[PDB]
Design a protein around this ligand. Structure first.
Ligand SMILES: CC(=O)SCCNC(=O)CCNC(=O)[C@H](O)C(C)(C)COP(=O)(O)OP(=O)(O)OC[C@H]1O[C@@H](n2cnc3c(N)ncnc32)[C@H](O)[C@@H]1OP(=O)(O)O
Ligand SMILES: CC(=O)SCCNC(=O)CCNC(=O)[C@H](O)C(C)(C)COP(=O)(O)OP(=O)(O)OC[C@H]1O[C@@H](n2cnc3c(N)ncnc32)[C@H](O)[C@@H]1OP(=O)(O)O
Ligand SMILES: NCC[C@H](O)C(=O)N[C@@H]1C[C@H](N)[C@@H](O[C@H]2O[C@H](CN)[C@@H](O)[C@H](O)[C@H]2O)[C@H](O)[C@H]1O[C@H]1O[C@H](CO)[C@@H](O)[C@H](N)[C@H]1O
Ligand SMILES: NCC[C@H](O)C(=O)N[C@@H]1C[C@H](N)[C@@H](O[C@H]2O[C@H](CN)[C@@H](O)[C@H](O)[C@H]2O)[C@H](O)[C@H]1O[C@H]1O[C@H](CO)[C@@H](O)[C@H](N)[C@H]1O
Lengths: 181, 180
């Protein structure tokens, strides 16, 4: 739909054209001012994109990836939020909020828990739509064994749609290239 | 689109209505003759679905879910194929093949490797569209460390759209029920 003149579309990676993927990369690399690696780009591909347009130009994005984690010893399906960006001139105008409202709806309909790793900019937005900083320990796979993600603790945030999740439990994430969180 | 009198639609789990979800569950229960658990149903939700219809009746389905695995020591992004079924009276008319052609296209656009655990009904079909038996060892997480998935070896199949060593070990991500 469209909200205050911005069109929002929800598209799986498999539904994007090459031109649309190139436009997405340009938006993301600019939005992070270069702090966006090739591995970061891989991490935002493979799930659902919510994309914001002013006329025909892409001006905002967020992706929701499926991840498979453990909450303590229990398997938990995760909607992992990646690569939220609003083009500079469009910021503080509600686009990030609209992207997150649609992201929350996607997570609620598919997964048991939303997770993400926040920037300082992002944290205020995710707080405003009901996410909380994860309070428990974080673990990632290195060479096939779990190690503590000590530096990422305090930066990961979560959201439970249906009911309650123990924010103090330990999370064990699945393996990928680059940054695990 | 359409193919040979059957309509095909691709959609993400997040777009399913409750009625569509219930119809999918009923199709899977009937098509697997009940060999399909609540965990199996969870495993087919969260990714892309390709659905086949005779006019308005759901007659076929396959899902592609994103998984995060290790190939030996290297991370590999996986399109994991779940819950392919065609209603019994519609079988052997090419619906499964059309579902797999669309599945291959989704995997090729999104992931580095396709993987699935086969049934005897599907194995020759998967072979016919490029899939091959995984020859390497399979591992899964139990109590936070990897153990060999010995019973599943020989039944997992893979598809490379590139080059992939089909003798490498695969380390899958953690879920409930059957890991493969
Ligand atoms: C999971 C991840 O992707 S983390 C990475 C987040 N992305 C980045 O850091 C890239 C650079 N930054 C951006 O692209 C943007 O600043 C975003 C995406 C973080 C926010 O997008 P915006 O469209 O500006 O957010 P929006 O206008 O909807 O803000 C909604 C509320 O969130 C809060 N908020 C948003 N941005 C900020 C900010 N920079 N500082 C303080 N509060 C903020 C405010 O409460 C705001 O409400 P208000 O404007 O009425 O005070
Ligand atoms: C990853 C997974 O989902 S594994 C589980 C697969 N699903 C099941 O076992 C549920 C029960 N079985 C079914 O629903 C169906 O038998 C399916 C989905 C496996 C196949 O669906 P169909 O629509 O019948 O497949 P389709 O008609 O496209 O067959 C294409 C080719 O695959 C082969 N094939 C398909 N089914 C069989 C079979 N039961 N026995 C031998 N060969 C078969 C044949 O070579 C066939 O070509 P042909 O008909 O010209 O001889
Ligand atoms: N002290 C070390 C912190 C550790 O490196 C870490 O958590 N690092 C965090 C790793 C995450 N993958 C990053 O995720 C965010 O940005 C990525 C691109 N840069 C996107 O791909 C990702 O989709 C998004 O979600 C996140 O931004 C990083 O946060 C860190 O970098 C931010 C930018 O400077 C800071 O604002 C944060 N306070 C700081 O913790
Ligand atoms: N000997 C041990 C076999 C081991 O249990 C195993 O690999 N078991 C395999 C476990 C997989 N999760 C199953 O996956 C298939 O069927 C599931 C529903 N039953 C779907 O959810 C799944 O989406 C699909 O992909 C797969 O079919 C099972 O295969 C086994 O059961 C099949 C049906 O009887 C046989 O035809 C196979 N030859 C046999 O290996």
């Amino acid at each position: 739909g469209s909200h205050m003149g911005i069109e929002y579309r929800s598209l799986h990676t498999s539904q994007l054209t090459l031109s649309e993927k190139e436009a997405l990369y340009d938006l993301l690399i600019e939005g992070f001012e270069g702090d966006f690696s090739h591995d970061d780009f891989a991490h935002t591909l493979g799930g659902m994109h919510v994309m914001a347009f002013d006329q025909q130009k892409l001006v905002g994005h967020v992706a929701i990836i499926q991840r498979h984690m453990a909450l303590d010893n229990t398997p938990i399906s995760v909607g992992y939020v990646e690569a939220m960006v609003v083009e500079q001139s469009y910021r503080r105008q509600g686009i990030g909020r609209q992207l997150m409202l649609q992201t929350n709806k996607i997570i609620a309909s598919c997964y048991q828990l939303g997770l993400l790793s926040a920037s300082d900019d992002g944290q205020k937005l995710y707080h405003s739509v009901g996410w909380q900083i994860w309070k428990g320990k974080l673990f990632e796979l290195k060479q096939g064994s779990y190690i503590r993600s000590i530096e990422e603790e305090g930066g990961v945030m979560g959201w439970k749609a249906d009911g309650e999740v123990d924010f103090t439990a330990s999370l064990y994430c699945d393996f990928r290239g680059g940054d695990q969180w």
